Design a protein around this ligand. Structure first.
Ligand SMILES: OC[C@H]1O[C@@H](O[C@@H]2[C@@H](O)[C@@H](O)O[C@H](CO)[C@H]2O)[C@H](O)[C@@H](O)[C@@H]1O
Ligand SMILES: OC[C@H]1O[C@@H](O[C@@H]2[C@@H](O)[C@H](O)O[C@H](CO)[C@H]2O)[C@H](O)[C@@H](O)[C@@H]1O
Ligand SMILES: OC[C@H]1O[C@@H](O[C@@H]2[C@@H](O)[C@H](O)O[C@H](CO)[C@H]2O)[C@H](O)[C@@H](O)[C@@H]1O
Length: 443
């Protein structure tokens, strides 16, 4: 109650991504994505799984709606699969794909769930990757075309759109570190990809407003990792700044109209992209909102012998960990205060926040994920502190609605507020999901 109340119009949702949940990978005209190629490459996924079935949400999105409704949410953040809309990436449209999402949008609106659509959550059409993917400027152009196509048919009903989800991931995990699709391992390729992602974003924003049948609220979604030096030594502070630049400022600064950060430009040297002024203008399209995805902090020590950005994580054995990450709720406060004071974007949404645990169905049938309840409660407490500081936060989306295909970790790593039995496709609300239900209902 006191100190726990969000605005009455606050957006409360959960979030997913198409490849992680949909399955039906060859159905209804869908093309091949880089994640189909990657997950079907031996050894890329930890457990031998693919997204071929996943949660079967292409067919079972109505069950997903049932969960959202049972949780008392008022919004659902999901992605549209470009392979279902333009199966060749650049080519004809697939009306069956558009019609599927049209039906889903209508189902959401009929349930009182505002759709928050992500256009690109990592499932680049493989034919585009065969032509260098995000390494090619042309991919940016045809992304904007895709964005146009989708807004023309859904923009009478969906006001809130994001272009990209987490370009750092797509660029640096996909092209530099090789852990995500398409799996390249070259810094220059990653940096070029980052630029073409940003350019695609900016071109898409402009294409979408031109194509819009009503005013839209268009954003981008960034993962941000607040970074802290492990000591105040020059070496460790510099390591923190490089990591901060690598993940955060590289994207935030050009979106803000500030160009690429010059420290990072000079650091990247020959690997840095040719960033002409006209591209940067386009990249800095005004945003109606910015989405923040937050999981963890980085406490950095200098790592001179490591790959760029020469910064290694120093885990704090004080702090608890989940199945895969350190828990640090106060980082969310810090990064939001940073955005509020230091950058121009507003309003803000938390578009993903959640955690993975070794969730199990208990003897009674529930999932007793108390650490995840505590994760949500602690992060939401930080959001109330941020709101009290004036941060213009307008909503929160729990990551994820349901356990899903967790990229290179496969089905093994459970992030849901609902448990997914991947054999039967049954979903079950976890205790943390019931806590969110009851917390939101108190609003
Ligand atoms: O890209 C802008 C600017 O970023 C600086 O990083 C600062 C860091 O020095 C310190 O002040 O903490 C804040 C917030 O985390 C960072 O934004 C770089 O040092 C600087 O080279 C760069 O121009
Ligand atoms: O891994 C869970 C979810 O991860 C999300 O991406 C994360 C970024 O926000 C973060 O900054 O980096 C981590 C890796 O260190 C990313 O995995 C994805 O957007 C989700 O799709 C995914 O389920
Ligand atoms: O004024 C608030 C809006 O600011 C937009 O961003 C940038 C400008 O404020 C800044 O001065 O210049 C750049 C480059 O032209 C602008 O894009 C944000 O994108 C919006 O979210 C924000 O409401």
């Amino acid at each position: 109650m006191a100190g726990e109340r969000f605005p009455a119009d606050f957006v409360w949702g959960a979030a997913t991504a198409a490849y992680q949940i949909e399955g039906a990978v060859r159905e209804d005209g869908r093309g091949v994505s880089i994640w189909d190629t990657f997950s079907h490459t031996p050894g890329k996924i930890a457990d031998g799984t693919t997204g071929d079935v996943a949660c079967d949400s292409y067919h079972r999105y109505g069950e997903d709606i049932g969960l959202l409704n049972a949780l008392g949410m008022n919004a659902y953040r999901f992605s549209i699969a470009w392979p279902r809309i333009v199966p060749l990436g650049a080519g004809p449209i697939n009306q069956a794909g558009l019609d599927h999402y049209s039906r889903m949008v209508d189902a959401l609106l009929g349930a009182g769930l505002q759709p928050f659509v992500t256009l690109y959550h990592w499932d680049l059409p493989q034919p585009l990757e065969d032509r260098l993917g995000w390494g090619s400027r042309a991919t940016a152009t045809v992304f904007a075309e895709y964005a146009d196509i989708v807004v023309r048919q859904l923009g009478d009903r969906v006001t809130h759109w994001a272009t990209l989800n987490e370009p750092w991931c797509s660029a640096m995990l996909g092209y530099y570190l090789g852990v995500h699709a398409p799996g390249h391992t070259d810094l220059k390729r990653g940096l070029e990809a980052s630029h073409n992602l940003l350019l695609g974003h900016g071109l898409a924003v402009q294409a979408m407003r031109a194509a819009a049948p009503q005013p839209l609220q268009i954003g981008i979604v960034l993962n941000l990792t607040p970074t802290y030096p492990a000591s105040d030594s020059p070496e460790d502070v510099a390591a923190a700044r490089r990591f901060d630049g690598f993940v955060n400022r590289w994207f935030l600064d050009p979106l803000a109209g500030r160009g690429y950060p010059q420290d990072m430009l000079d650091y990247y040297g020959a690997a840095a992209p040719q960033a002409n002024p006209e591209d940067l203008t386009q990249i800095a399209a005004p945003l109606d909102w910015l989405g923040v995805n937050y999981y963890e902090r980085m406490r950095a020590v200098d790592a001179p012998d490591a790959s760029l950005p020469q910064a290694q994580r120093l885990d704090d054995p004080d702090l608890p960990h989940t199945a895969d990450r350190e828990v640090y709720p106060e980082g969310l406060y810090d990064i939001l205060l940073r955005l509020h004071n230091d950058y121009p974007f507003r309003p803000l949404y938390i578009t993903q926040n959640g955690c993975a645990l070794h969730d199990e169905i208990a003897e009674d049938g529930g999932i007793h994920d108390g650490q995840r309840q505590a994760f949500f409660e602690a992060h939401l407490a930080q959001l109330q502190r941020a709101l009290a500081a004036g941060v213009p936060l307008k909503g929160y989306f729990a990551w994820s609605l349901l356990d899903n295909f967790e990229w290179a970790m496969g089905l093994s790593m459970r992030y849901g507020i609902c448990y997914t039995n991947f054999e039967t496709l049954e979903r079950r609300i976890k205790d943390s999901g019931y806590w969110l239900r009851d917390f939101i209902a108190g609003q």
